[PDB]
């Protein structure tokens, strides 16, 4: 019954900003850490961001910092990926994935397509 739906994706142009949202349901939200993982067209999976339970700790991979900032609304059960300084390398399918309590990314979303002109 666990559902992770993402939105906000679309066709943007270099130098603009975007905001991606991930509505979550079917499970208590404040008991899991969250991830943003992206996949460039025809390429492999790449980890982007990670936010903790309380949202106090945010870890970003390289190629993204200052540009990307991750947020978490526990009151409305939604995840956020604020994407500034968008580049042609950023064009990818963005999934939000929740961490299994034992570590791995147990449940994923169907992702949103972001393309950069």
Numbering used by the authors: 1 to 117
How does the study describe this entry?
CTLA-4 is a member of CD28-B7 immunoglobulin superfamily of immune regulatory molecules which acts as a negative regulator of T cell activation, especially CD28-dependent T cell responses. CTLA-4 functions to inhibit T cell activity via the binding to common ligands with CD28, the B7-1 (CD80) or B7-2 (CD86), with significantly higher binding affinity than that with CD28. CTLA-4 is an immunoglobulin molecule constituted by two β-sheet faces, the front A’GFCC’ β-sheet face and the back ABED β-sheet face.
We expressed the single chain Fv fragment (scFv) of ipilimumab and the extracellular domain of CTLA-4 as inclusion bodies in E. coli. Specifically, HCDR2 and HCDR3 of VH domain and LCDR3 of VL provided predominant contacts to CTLA-4 with partial contributions from LCDR1. The binding of ipilimumab on CTLA-4 mainly located on the front β-sheet face constituted by C, G and F strands with multiple hydrogen bonds to E68 on C strand, K130, E132 and M134 on F strand, and Y139, L141 and I143 on G strand of CTLA-4. Within this interface, VH and VL contributed equally with similar numbers of hydrogen bonds to CTLA-4, i.e. five hydrogen bonds for VH vs four hydrogen bonds for VL, respectively. The results revealed that the binding of ipilimumab and B7-1 to CTLA-4 has stereo clash to each other. The overlapped binding surface on CTLA-4 by B7-1 and ipilimumab was also predominantly located on both F strand (K130, E132, M134 and Y135) and G strand (P137, Y139 and L141) of CTLA-4, the very region occupied by VH and VL of ipilimumab. The variations in the loops may be explained by the flexibility of these loops while none of these loops were participated in the interaction with MAbs or B7-1.
